[PDB]
Amino acid sequence: LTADQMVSALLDAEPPILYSEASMMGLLTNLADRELVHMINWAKRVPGFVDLTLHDQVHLLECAWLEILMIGLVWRSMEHPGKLLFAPNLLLDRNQGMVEIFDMLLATSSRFRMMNLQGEEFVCLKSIILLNSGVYTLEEKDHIHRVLDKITDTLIHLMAKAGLTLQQQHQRLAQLLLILSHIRHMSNKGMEHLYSMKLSDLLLEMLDAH
Amino acid sequence: KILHRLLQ
Numbered sequence: 163l164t165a166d167q168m169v170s171a172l173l174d175a176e177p178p179i180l181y182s183e184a185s186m187m188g189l190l191t192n193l194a195d196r197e198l199v200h201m202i203n204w205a206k207r208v209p210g211f212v213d214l215t216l217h218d219q220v221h222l223l224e225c226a227w228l229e230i231l232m233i234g235l236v237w238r239s240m241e242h243p244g245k246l247l248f249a250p251n252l253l254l255d256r257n258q259g260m261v262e263i264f265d266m267l268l269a270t271s272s273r274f275r276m277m278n279l280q281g282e283e284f285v286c287l288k289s290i291i292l293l294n295s296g297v298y299t300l301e302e303k304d305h306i307h308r309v310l311d312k313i314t315d316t317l318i319h320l321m322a323k324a325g326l327t328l329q330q331q332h333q334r335l336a337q338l339l340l341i342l343s344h345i346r347h348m349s350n351k352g353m354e355h356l357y358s359m360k361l362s363d364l365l366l367e368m369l370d371a372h
Numbered sequence: 373k374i375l376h377r378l379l380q
């Protein structure tokens with residue numbers, strides 16, 4: 163596949179923006195739960211995902227589902243500084259919270275804005291999370307890394323086409339990937355927070371994997 | 373369990 167077809171394929175597979183309706187938890191469960199149904203269909207449309215086994219697809223989504231949810235919330239909240247756009251009708255401030263995990267989402271949102279992250283780079287970073295979050299947990303592993311190398315080739319291509327020099331392409335690719343380490347830390351603390359809230363049948367299944 | 377039916 164191309165570097166251009168990779169972006170358009172990810173751009174076309176983007177999920178929609180859903181709407182919302184002790185009290186705060188209620189809106190977030192229904193939002194996450196309904197938001198994963200589209201994430202399952204989006205995952206199937208990521209190049210190379212359907213090539214994996216049914217068990218591999220399950221495991222990859224079991225450990226990356228909350229990471230993808232958070233990077234998506236950060237993306238649509240990137241242009242609402244100091245706020246988080248859970249939904250078009252659910253734009254919440256830093257005082258409407260939990261807050262520990264709230265501040266981390268805002269810092270990431272303010273960081274993407276600092277780097278002026280583009281949509282073409284967002285869909286790539288989101289696909290990397292889906293394929294990398296569970297790769298370290300034999301012939302199938304080489305294929306996942308083969309796709310990951312292709313997405314990396316796509317990120318660089320987007321940076322090179324943007325006028326960046328080689329030193330700046332490597333620096334931007336490093337800055338983007340280093341944020342995934344913080345996005346994973348946010349999901350780790352978010353899994354402990356939702357496990358300390360004891361929802362939805364599909365959710366609870368995701369809660370028992372961690 | 374459930375997750376399998378969604379990808380199925």
Ligand SMILES: O=C(Cc1ccccc1)Sc1cc(NCc2ccc(O)cc2)nc(Cl)n1
Nearest residue numbers: 190193194197231232235263264352355356
């Ligand atoms: O326990 C917490 C969160 C949680 C909610 C649902 C399932 C598992 C964990 S705290 C918390 C969760 C959260 N957003 C995550 C999120 C993003 C998009 C979306 O549509 C729904 C939720 N944000 C904050 Cl600031 N705080």
